[model samples]
Structure formats: structure tokens, C-alpha cells
Target: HTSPLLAPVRQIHAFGDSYSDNGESQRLTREMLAKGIAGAQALPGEVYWQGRWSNGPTAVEVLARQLGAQLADHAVGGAKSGADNYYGWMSAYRHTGLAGQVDAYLATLDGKPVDGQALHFIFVSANDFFEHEDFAGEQPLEQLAGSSVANIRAAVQRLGEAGARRFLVVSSTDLSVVPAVVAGNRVERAQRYLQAVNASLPIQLAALRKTRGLELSWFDHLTFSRHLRRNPARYGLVELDAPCQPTQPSVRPACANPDQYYFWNEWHPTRRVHQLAGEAMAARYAR
Candidate 1:
């Protein structure tokens, strides 16, 4: 099931938000794994790994293992795509944003040449779109969205300069209907901005490839989520609007039967979804 394009990958440099965050600490949660994140963790009471965001292996973990690639996951939970420090990279316990993620990835290389067969995966955007930031002293909604893409572009450019050849970009989707976005409807602007950014991604990246001559792959998560919502039964997911942590300063075991739900927490995908997503990536890059 290995994707042709990705089959040759010997190492994986993963970066992004919770969708790919394999802990940003010692080894797993805020605990980022240093040894290329193993797919399973020995969590008690649960036979499978409910560790990280996904109940089992994240898509980040799943697809990378297919190639027997070493994984360096630096995805910080609640992170956004931005190189600007004034932006929302403001996490209390983890690195600030995608820029910081890139910094970590670069540091790992230790000035070593990037592997020609190595693939760099970026899966951010959720927080950049879902969290309401004043975006103070700067751009409005559309501009802010554009800035996010620009920031992502800068990171990719940096990777290319650092000698990364293959890049997989997973754009953000709409969470307008999620439980958190529902009740008070806080993420309206974020969704509006997210949608705009997702729409512009293809064109922007298309141009990016030409300028950088880098192998680039882009997936439309927004439309894909809509399809999932339209036919949840097709994917065996019963809930999308299910809340992960019902209260603040609380998470994990966030509910019953994490496998039965579509989301691991209020916003991240469950194990099955990650499986599906990884499969999708395999199919997309299949050899």
C-alpha cells in the first residue's frame, strides 16, 4: 500500500497542529517523542494507544511507518501557521507556532544535509482559523487568512532552502458545525477565514512549486470533511459535534468509546479517522 512517490522516503519530518501533534514534550501529550514516535504506547486499561490526539496512531504516525521512516513530530497542540512572533504561537506549555515547529525540525538536522528521500509534512491551520484572535494591529479576516498561507509558504521555503525535497500540505477544514464552534458560535470568523485560506491554497502552492522546483502535495481537508459530515455512516463515525473535554483543564478519556467517535477530543480526529487519513495519504502518494 505504499505510495509510489512516498515509498522512497527514509525519514519523515512532521510538523503541524493537533492533527499531527505526537506530543510536544518528553515523549508523548506535551510529551513529544524524540525517537521518531512509535505507533503504540502502553496505556493502562486500554489495549490500544489512546495516546496523543488520536485514540491510536495519528495519521502522522500511521503513514510514516509505511515507509519505515524515522519520524520527528514537532507539532504543538493548539498551534497556528505563522512565522510572526506577535501571532498566535502563544501556547503556554508548547512551542508557539509553525515557525517554532520549523525551528525544531531544523535543529534536529543539526546542519546535516536533508535526505533526498525524506518528506516534510505540515498539517496545521485549525487553531489559526478556529481561535478568535484580534489579529490586533494588523490584517482583517481575509488578509489574516492570506497571511497564514504566506506564513506556511515561508516555512516551506525554509525547508526547501534546508534541502527538503518533498512536501505534503494538509489544508484546514471548516469546523463551523463543531460543538465548540456551535453554542456561542465563536469561531465564525475563524471558519470564514479558514475557508478562504483553503480555497486559495491550490493556486498559491501551484505557483510555489514553480518557483522552488520542489515536489509538493496538497489535500483539501475542508471538502473532505464536508463529505464525511454528509455521510458519516460511510466512515463508521457517529459524532462530529461531540465535545472532547466538556470542561477546561480537563482532557483525555474525554468521553466513552473514543473509537466510536469521529473526534478524539472536541476537535481532533479519532483513531479510525487517522487510519482513514493515512490510507488517503498512501493512496494519494502511492507508487
Candidate 2:
């Protein structure tokens, strides 16, 4: 006897970018040349802390551990892993191509079938906009937004057709507030672009809900950031804008204690902040 609202999903597949990958694999860390200071010694603590890109756990890892679901993590650094190469920003190496990853993951489950439903989590697209050196000439941002939403919708549709019944999509965070973007000129303009990407998410989810017949949910970072910003004491975040340790002028300053910061670098969130994000996602998906 169980509550009608609660049902278990047999498997959970997470796909996205650096945030999802968390740079947890040594192999990947080595390939990327890791992060290095211009004149500092490249020692153990100097680089690659347990394969994580930042100071703590990634959202996907924390979420998977919290849910106790069989997990497949296909996220990589600098990869728009969901979108195609039509856009110049898409990285070939890290992303592994959208079609290829999807096809390979599907092939792995060839002869296997499950009793319960499945959930697909897609979190991607920060690199698409933030990596651009010039936003004005970068195809109007809406094109990137359209591509991201389209790719996610297509992927979710394919998964649904293959018997997956649930999908959870984590939208891109507010890149405007990110250290790199905030430090640049036209911060307000960049924020408008970020808002464009985020605004497209609900529209895509609504359409997919009717067409794919799957239970879908969206996690908005806008709301999450407010909590982190207004009530840092509540979330346990120490620093919001700066890095945890001292860094070069080009890089975000690192804080004395990374555990207190919400962001570890110009872009990635610190471990403590990621844990907060993971817990929030888990609570929502649990419902």
C-alpha cells in the first residue's frame, strides 16, 4: 500500500556540461591541462581537486546520491553536450556530439527492460553564451536559446518514446551575475540574453508535456539565486562573487574558505552551493 502520488523511476540518466561532469575524472582533468596559475608551481593542491572543477561536488553527483537512482553521467567540460554543431560555440571534444551520445546510451540498454518508469535530466548551455567574446555579433542569443530548447525537447521526446515517463530539466543559471560577465561592460545587456534563454524553457516544457505525454519539471536558477543572494546565512554560502583563494587579475579571486562561497571560479559554483542546488532538485523531483 503506497500513496498514489509516489512512484519510483527505475533509472535516471543525467546529461549536460561542466556542471554535470564536475570534472571528477582524472583522465578528463589531465586532458584539459587543468587550471594553472601563470607563475605558480603546479602541485597537487595547485590543480585538480579529486577531479572536481571547483571546490566541491557537482549537482548531478549529489542528486544521484540523494535519489539512490542508477545513474549515467555523460557531462563534460566546455561541452554544450545537448546541441549540435550548427552553432559555433558547441565544443566537439567535450560534447561528443549530441546524436552520438544519445545513440550510444540507448544502445547500452538494448536487451534490457525495466518494470518501473525512467527519468532523464538535462542541464546545459552556460558555455554557449558566456564563452562568447562578443555577445552583440553572436547570433542574437535567441538562436542559442532556440537550439538549446530544441535539442532538449528532441532528446526528451526520444527518451519518452523508448518508455521513459518522466523528465527533469535544469535551466542555465543567471550568467549575468557570474563573475566573468559581471566584470564586463554591458552587464545589463548580457543579463537580457540570459533571461531570454531562461524564458524559453517553460515554453518548451509546456509543449513537450502535451506532445510526449511525460511528467516534466523545470528548475529555475533565477529563484535559486535570490535565496542564495538574499539569505546567504540560510544557505550557508560564504562568498558569492569572488573565488575562495587568491587568483590572478584575469581570474576570480579565491576565498580563504571555499566552503563558504557560492561560486568557485568565474563560472562554476562552489561545492557547498552545488550541494544546495542538488538538495533543491532532489526535493522537487521527489515529489
Judged by lDDT, which candidate is best? 1
Write the residue-wise lDDT of candidate 2 on 161-237 in tens digits.
Answer: 76777777887787777776776764775677668778887787788788867788788877888778898987667
Cα RMSD for candidate 1? 6.2
Candidate 1 local lDDT, 1-287, one digit each (tens):
63555346667788887677665521432232233333422221232244465567788788787656688877755677874222232333246578877876778776688876778888877666655453343557788778788888888888888888888888875667655556556567657877788888768888877898888888777777787778988888786777543432344446776655776555657787787777676556543
**What range of 10 consecutive residues in model 2 has the weakest lDDT sum?**
36-45
lDDT of each: 0.67, 0.65
Global CA lDDT computed for model 2: 0.65
TM-score (all chains, Cα) for each model: 0.79, 0.80
